[PDB]
Design a binder for this molecule. Structure first.
Ligand SMILES: *[C@@H]1O[C@H](CO)[C@@H](O)[C@H](O[C@H]2O[C@H](CO)[C@H](O)[C@H](O)[C@H]2O)[C@H]1NC(C)=O
Ligand SMILES: *[C@@H]1O[C@H](CO)[C@@H](O)[C@H](O[C@H]2O[C@H](CO)[C@H](O)[C@H](O)[C@H]2O)[C@H]1NC(C)=O
Ligand SMILES: [Pt+2]
Ligand SMILES: [Pt+2]
Lengths: 158, 158
């Protein structure tokens, strides 16, 4: 009459799952900031356009000509995507999202490579003047381990 | 779409089972030498009788008047129970039995407390003369951790 054998199969499948569990914990989180990155890249046409037609970065959602509140640029895991002086910043929600990335953010910004702009992707940045952004890391930025290698740009990237 | 939650329940039930598994491993083994002890205590009436009617310990199964081969005193986990000079020794099988106790043994022997005998239970012993046994530990004796506290007698017990 065999509990033991069953207790061995439960035991080996349950440590395998505990072993897997971190990897899938980190897989999901990368798929959840993947959307934030996509919601923010949607906004680059408008920003690029706005800067090209005028010489000035759009001050907000409404200048660039995208939905006036950021909360309307929201997804399954992103709460809001926001243009603030040509820098678009996506904030993760705090529901349906992994704890180490809930409520955190990344940013896309561009530099003029005179004739067009050059875009970058990375952790939050604030525009200081028409060609320089500065790190805006306040402790709510997506950790580097969850950012793709494409979106690892530092404030001074060129 | 939730693998994670399931992976957490599998993970917690599987470490609990790995935690339990030693205890139940040791539970079973105590229930398996429990039978060896019972198969050997069955044989004490005959041995006690034989010594009382004569002054000599029975030399074998056939003198004491129990089944001439020990292999016929066998159970679910015991292979054979054997009278050899008044000492009855039970050997565990090597199938249906836990590895740390498979093939190992214990022994019951008595001393004359003149008028009757006094019995003891413990790890194997060999009779040296009509009143002394000696430890017969050859490396095939049941470990102390699996012997009940009732069956912890040392060779020189009185
Ligand atoms: C759109 O982005 C421009 C970047 O250079 C801003 O000037 C612009 O603000 C100006 O236009 C609005 C129009 O209502 C207001 O008059 C502001 O006071 C102006 O500075 C900005 N538009 C918005 C709605 O902020
Ligand atoms: C039964 O136990 C006795 C203990 O004192 C032994 O002597 C006895 O052996 C003797 O009797 C048998 C009978 O067949 C043989 O004759 C032996 O040679 C005797 O020593 C023992 N009986 C057995 C079967 O060993
Ligand atoms: Pt304009
Ligand atoms: Pt006799």
């Amino acid at each position: 009459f065999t509990l033991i054998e069953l207790m061995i199969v439960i035991a080996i499948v349950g440590i395998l799952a505990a072993v897997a569990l971190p990897a899938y914990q980190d897989y999901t989180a990368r798929a959840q900031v993947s959307e934030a990155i996509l919601l923010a890249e949607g906004q680059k046409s408008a920003v690029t356009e706005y800067y090209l037609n005028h010489g000035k970065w759009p001050e907000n959602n409404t200048s660039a000509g995208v939905a006036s509140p950021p909360s309307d640029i929201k997804g399954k895991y992103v709460k809001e995507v926001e243009v603030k002086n040509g820098v678009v910043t996506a904030t993760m929600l705090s529901s349906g999202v992994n704890n180490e990335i809930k409520g955190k953010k990344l940013s896309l910004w561009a530099r003029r490579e005179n004739g067009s702009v050059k875009w970058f992707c990375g952790q939050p940045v604030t525009r200081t003047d028409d060609d320089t952004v500065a790190d805006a890391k306040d402790g709510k930025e997506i950790d580097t381990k969850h950012l793709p290698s494409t979106c690892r740009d530092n404030f001074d990237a060129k």
